[PDB]
Design a protein around this ligand. Structure first.
Ligand SMILES: *[C@@H]1O[C@H](CO)[C@@H](O[C@@H]2O[C@H](CO)[C@@H](O)[C@H](O)[C@H]2NC(C)=O)[C@H](O)[C@H]1NC(C)=O
Ligand SMILES: *[C@@H]1O[C@H](CO)[C@@H](O[C@@H]2O[C@H](CO)[C@@H](O)[C@H](O)[C@H]2NC(C)=O)[C@H](O)[C@H]1NC(C)=O
Ligand code: NAG
Ligand code: NAG
Ligand code: NAG
Ligand code: NAG
Ligand code: NAG
Lengths: 1017, 188, 49, 49
């Protein structure tokens, strides 16, 4: 017994495909399944819907195969044998052998050749010979391939596909298969099972990889995502249900047979105008004998299939019978017009019964005419359904009013049928009876009722699944059923014992798979949603999962969360920042095993609060941060008529009847294209002049070489822009889909951003509110320092340090972008989502929508107009909904880029053209300046900010009393180092002596709380 | 319930949100506006109030000389919030109006399973028990086309309604950065 | 629990793999909304006793 | 062209209402657009389809 080692794939069809990850749903060999092994023995082996036959030998031993269904001297089977130079195929009838064999020449396996049909003599641990057979669809297909092997252990790794060789159009059955060689040579036999695969075609068109969909959960995630590598995260794979155990059927006792014979075998029948009706109730009727009782001339009945009539229960059977004249039968049907249909007997359109008719010439044929049967003639109005008219008085039809007489304008209402034995079948009589459709039930049984397992039921007429537990919802002494909110079927009353149960369907849920990533490892964990996994292990959750899934459905580690229960992960106590979310504050990660824990919000910190304590920084740092925002998306135009008709003159005219649904889509698609140019203009084109940086570079030690354009490259783009362009690359033709080019190129956006940079460097904030006025850069930095509350002499005394920090900060952005390939993620999602929407709109053109074919050429050139409009119209309905869905989703998605484009316009005006005083709008810390950069479909902002450091604690007081007066600071605070008092600014430590010019006086020192004593110079 | 309708739990529970709010309150009480830009620096509360008075153009001797009055006014002002929230139950009308709209859309989806668009019945176990296979496919195809339209209208309105909530969440995050982590000079 | 359904529904294309992707996107979005409002302080602070 | 923005709101809200009324004069794959000729030329059982 040896399992499969990834072997046994073939080419399902003769169609060439390259570089496509196609999916198939054909019979295949399940992966990792054991096969039988044989080696001087060769017994019988059943065929059983497929074979993976393979024999390995270094010498020519295997000769041929013989098949069959019964292996007798009567059965038809093949006699495939191999000659010295040719091959022989013969599927005929011959003589079988109890122990056939085949050592130079042996002839003891056959002695008959009678009734032979097909002959097809044609060309034909060291070597593997693997063959695959199958018999289906009135055909028998043979596939094979061979390859040398250098191994002495077993079948090697990898696989190679199989190709067709021949075909044999035959109709036969086969239930046995035995080989015949020349101690016996080894070989294997495996069977085939329906499955679903996913194969890969290389460039040349050869299958080199395939995966299953029911082996392990990771394979299911691969199938759902349609790829061969899955990244980190949690994915939703499939659903989950329970299967029932058995069925219960319960019918009333009722033991008596319906009076069918007295209705069908009545000697005397009434008239059509005075049809008699008979009521049937509380009986058991078998309709099988009803059809077989006699040969009826017409049984075509509506609403119920006659085969299923034996398994339905009704409330009443209103039978009625009458007699008409020959061809008048055609009026006995709903929606018909005629004398019988109008003035005699009307069938309502909601009729749900059956009609049975037959002739009997040898029952009512008298010579000279049978005048006992009469039928109504000209009347006033139309008879309502199921209404009988019994009046036979003379009716007046004319202007002259007559009273009780006849003659002119007054005639006897009825008329005598001319039933004569020599009359034609058109005027011959006819016998008909109509059945119109709990009391009447058919034959059945009654199995004892179960109480704790969810099973099928057929209580009275309702079919369904669910559990049956006792119900304590008191019923009134006459009710039968019960229904809860939203009209859901519920508690039912048992016909045998007066009892009320409950109905609740078997449990269902959803399955998700957590994967660390195939690049790292392979093991996975599985989560069942909103299910208390007390039923999963064995006896309940076995409907679609192979036994390999059992280890992932039960085991040693099972942990119950609020989102369900997790199988395959262990529970720890300590908590970290979490990576993969699950829900209810539980996350999972990889520790190399899978770890599930609780989230941690952050670290701990207790600020030392006191009545008279303060903290003031003594140093600072300069920081730079990034920010990415999208501005625009790709223009797309789709042609109306080309998509749904495809250059067919027989389709265009059938579309004009629908109206203006076709020209209302192009306008909507043009609106977005118009908007995604104003989006860019609002953001980048807001300076009216082009500025240039001076040739020399003396900016006080600051170095702007990494954001300014370079003259040693044709692109005229900054190195940061080069990296951004190379990181992200800037949906097929045919079928009337086009892409329009943007109005502004990239070499123009580069010019705009260079102009903005030159303006902010050489002028400041002046060029955005009038004419541009020049100013040296360190003076501008002094002005910007004064805007956050720090005096300007701080900058001038620490110029070199600030310049060095600025230069070092800008040199780490390149690394922080080129070392993290997941940084420009916001701009990749807009590109990815647009391609997915356009990829589905082209796959929807290969769908039938309920038609013979999905191509308009085959339908047209296989049929004529009057019955081709029905098939075409069913394709213009489904192909128009696919376009309506696409346009609506794009209108919503474009309202999200407009919101992001409008925000980017605010940032450029308030962060690049000025200094902002709001918080977190323009980065962390205190804002100093900002610089713009260009992206393929967006913008990038680099912010420069101010952050304190190196704090120290002092002692403070709100005021000072001296000579009976209270002294207050002008702009500062009062601090002490333990012996002396000073005055300093709030964002930087720089002590000074308290005097008059930095202090104002108001009031005496007997009101404020916390005043201290000191001296003022 | 049932019929393929599930509700998933949020990632953050209520306790964690309570901890976040408590941390923000502690930071704003014991440290001022400093912790929103760097390391937290302590400062006594009346001095923080004196700082905040300077931002609106009032000199700081006004606060110190009337501390016991501002304290009483602040304490009395908060105590009236409970008496106004407890009464007038229509105060939280912006939060009930979003719970109702979602639940009014799940009812119309389930209630539409009781329609029988141009067919014999509304339940699929009766057209499959009273009819032959070749005929019981025109009736089944009519029910499918109606249930797909009902499930398509539901998704479109959820997309439009979701875009409206994202606008409010983007506004609230601005008020937390600008009116809680610092002082604001914008009007209203 | 009806196979005639699953055999008849396949002919309409992919009109409920598109409906199961919009709702997941909506559900995922109502987690950045809560994170963008409350989670903006790194540490946890405690009021003095 | 000074008051361009406000004029486009009026025009868009009037083009849409015109298209809706004009769509009442299309067959959609039937014999006639008016209901009083469908009934007055066909009998009910197949006039309903
Ligand atoms: C203020 O911080 C700066 C850091 O930005 C300090 O400058 C560094 O000083 C160390 C000496 O201890 C040098 O090794 C570094 O090279 C300096 N940094 C740079 C960028 O040159 C500065 O000394 C600090 N000042 C005080 C008073 O502590
Ligand atoms: C607190 O600061 C005062 C500043 O006035 C320090 O007092 C001076 O300390 C220097 C250092 O020896 C002396 O030369 C001066 O004579 C002191 N007085 C003045 C008026 O400058 C004081 O030492 C500091 N206290 C501590 C603990 O460092
Ligand atoms: C009428 O009589 C015949 C006699 O052979 C019988 O076979 C048939 O079943 C009877 N009809 C009914 C409806 O039972
Ligand atoms: C048959 O009659 C008995 C008598 O009480 C009772 O069980 C019930 O009415 C009938 N059984 C059924 C309907 O299964
Ligand atoms: C400062 O606060 C502390 C804390 O209780 C206490 O000594 C007193 O309330 C205040 N002291 C002075 C001198 O104001
Ligand atoms: C600015 O930095 C770049 C990158 O290190 C360097 O090549 C250039 O020489 C610097 N500028 C000056 C004026 O040295
Ligand atoms: C300041 O000096 C006055 C005058 O003696 C005294 O009354 C007051 O208590 C002193 N204040 C402090 C804080 O020592």
């Amino acid at each position: 017994y040896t399992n499969s080692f990834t072997r046994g794939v073939y080419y399902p069809d003769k169609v060439f495909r390259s570089s496509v990850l196609h999916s198939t749903q054909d019979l295949f060999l399940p992966f990792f399944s054991n096969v039988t092994w044989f080696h001087f023995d060769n017994p019988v082996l059943p065929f059983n819907d497929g074979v993976y036959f393979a024999s390995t030998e270094k010498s020519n031993i295997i000769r041929g195969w013989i098949f069959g269904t019964t292996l007798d001297s009567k059965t038809q089977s093949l006699l495939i044998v191999n000659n010295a130079t040719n091959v022989v195929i013969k599927v005929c009838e011959f003589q079988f052998c109890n122990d056939p064999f085949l050592m130079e020449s042996e002839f003891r396996v056959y002695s008959s050749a009678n009734n032979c049909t097909f002959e097809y003599v044609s060309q034909p641990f060291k070597n593997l010979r693997e063959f695959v057979f199958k018999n289906i669809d009135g055909y028998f297909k043979i596939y094979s391939k061979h390859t040398p092997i250098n191994l002495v252990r077993d079948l090697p790794q990898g696989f190679s596909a199989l190709e067709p060789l021949v075909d044999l159009p035959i109709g036969i059955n086969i239930t046995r298969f035995q080989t015949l060689l020349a101690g016996a040579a080894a070989y294997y036999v495996g069977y085939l099972q329906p499955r679903t695969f996913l194969l890969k075609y290389n460039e040349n068109g050869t299958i080199t990889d395939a995966v299953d969909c029911a082996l392990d959960p990771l394979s299911e995630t691969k199938c759902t995502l349609k790829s061969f590598t899955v990244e980190k995260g949690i994915y939703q794979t499939s659903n989950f249900r329970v299967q029932p155990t058995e069925s219960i059927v319960r019918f009333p006792n009722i033991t008596n047979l319906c009076p069918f014979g007295e209705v069908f075998n009545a000697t005397r029948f009434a008239s059509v105008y005075a049809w008699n009706r008979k009521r049937i109730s509380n009986c058991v009727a078998d309709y099988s004998v009803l059809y077989n009782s006699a040969s009826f001339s017409t049984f075509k009945c509506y609403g119920v299939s006659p085969t299923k009539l034996n398994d339905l229960c009704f409330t009443n059977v209103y039978a009625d019978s009458f007699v008409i004249r020959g061809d008048e039968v055609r009026q006995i049907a709903p929606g018909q017009t005629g004398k019988i249909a109008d003035y005699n007997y009307k069938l309502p359109d909601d009729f749900t019964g059956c009609v049975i008719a037959w002739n009997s010439n040898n029952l009512d044929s008298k010579v000279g005419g049978n005048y006992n049967y009469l039928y109504r003639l000209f009347r006033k109005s139309n008879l309502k359904p199921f209404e009988r008219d019994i009046s036979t008085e003379i009716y007046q039809a004319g202007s002259t009013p007559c009273n009780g007489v006849e003659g002119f304008n007054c005639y006897f209402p009825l008329q005598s049928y001319g039933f004569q034995p020599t009359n034609g079948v058109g005027y011959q009589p006819y016998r008909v009876v109509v059945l119109s459709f709990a009391t009447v039930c058919g034959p059945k049984k009654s199995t004892n009722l179960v109480k704790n397992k969810c099973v099928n039921f057929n209580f009275n007429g309702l079919t369904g699944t669910g559990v049956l537990t006792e119900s304590n919802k008191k019923f009134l002494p006459f009710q039968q059923f019960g229904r809860d909110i939203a009209d859901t079927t519920d508690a039912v009353r048992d016909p045998q014992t007066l009892e009320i149960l409950d109905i609740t369907p078997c449990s269902f849920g959803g399955v998700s798979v957590i994967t660390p990533g195939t690049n790292t490892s392979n093991q996975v964990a599985v989560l069942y949603q909103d299910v208390n996994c007390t039923e999963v292990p064995v006896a309940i959750h076995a409907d679609q999962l192979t036994p390999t899934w059992r280890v992932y459905s039960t085991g040693s580690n099972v942990f119950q969360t609020r989102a369900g229960c997790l199988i395959g992960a262990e529970h720890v106590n300590n908590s970290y920042e979490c990576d993969i979310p699950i829900g209810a504050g539980i996350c999972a990660s990889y520790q190399t095993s899978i770890i599930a824990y609780t989230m941690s919000l952050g670290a701990e910190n207790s600020v030392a609060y006191s009545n008279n304590s303060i903290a003031i920084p003594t140093n600072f740092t300069i920081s730079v941060t990034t920010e990415i925002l999208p501005v625009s998306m790709t223009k797309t135009s789709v042609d109306c008529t080309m998509y749904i008709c495809g250059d067919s003159t027989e389709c265009s005219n059938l579309l004009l009847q629908y109206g203006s649904f076709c020209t209302q889509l192009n306008r909507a698609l043009t609106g977005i294209a118009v908007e995604q140019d104003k989006n860019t203009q609002e953001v980048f084109a807001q300076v009216k002049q082009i500025y240039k940086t001076p040739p020399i570079k003396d900016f006080g030690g600051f170095n702007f070489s990494q954001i300014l354009p370079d003259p040693s490259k044709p692109s005229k783009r900054s190195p940061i822009e080069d990296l951004l362009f190379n990181k992200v690359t800037l949906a097929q033709k045919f079928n009337g889909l086009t892409v329009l080019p943007p109005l502004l190129t990239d070499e123009m956006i580069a010019q705009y951003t260079s102009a903005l940079l030159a303006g902010t460097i050489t002028s400041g904030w002046t060029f955005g509110a009038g004419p541009a006025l020049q100013i040296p850069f360190p003076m501008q930095m002094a002005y910007r320092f004064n805007g956050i509350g720090v005096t300007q002499n701080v900058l001038y005394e620490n110029q070199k340090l600030i310049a060095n920090q600025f230069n070092s900060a800008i040199g780490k952005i390149q690394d922080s972008l080129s070392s993290t390939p997941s940084a420009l993620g916001k701009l990749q999602d807009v590109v990815n989502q647009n391609a997915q929407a356009l990829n589905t709109l082209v796959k929807q053109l290969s769908s039938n929508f309920g038609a013979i074919s999905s191509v308009l050429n085959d339908i047209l050139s296989r049929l004529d107009p009057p019955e081709a409009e029905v098939q075409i119209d069913r394709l213009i309905t489904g192909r128009l909904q696919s376009l309506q869905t696409y346009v609506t989703q794009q209108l919503i998605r474009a309202a999200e880029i407009r919101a992001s484009a409008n925000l980017a316009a605010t940032k450029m005006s308030e962060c690049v053209l000025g200094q902002s005083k709001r918080v977190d709008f323009c980065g962390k810390g205190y804002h100093l300046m900002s610089f713009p950069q260009s992206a393929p479909h967006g913008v990038v902002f680099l912010h420069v900010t101010y952050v304190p450091a190196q704090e120290k604690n002092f002692t403070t007081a709100p005021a000072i009393c001296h000579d009976g007066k209270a002294h207050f600071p002008r702009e500062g605070v009062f601090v002490s180092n333990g012996t002396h008092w000073f005055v300093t600014q709030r964002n930087f430590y720089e002590p000074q002596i308290i005097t008059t010019d930095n202090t104002f006086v108001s009031g005496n020192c007997d009101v404020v709380i916390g005043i201290v004593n000191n001296t003022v110079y």
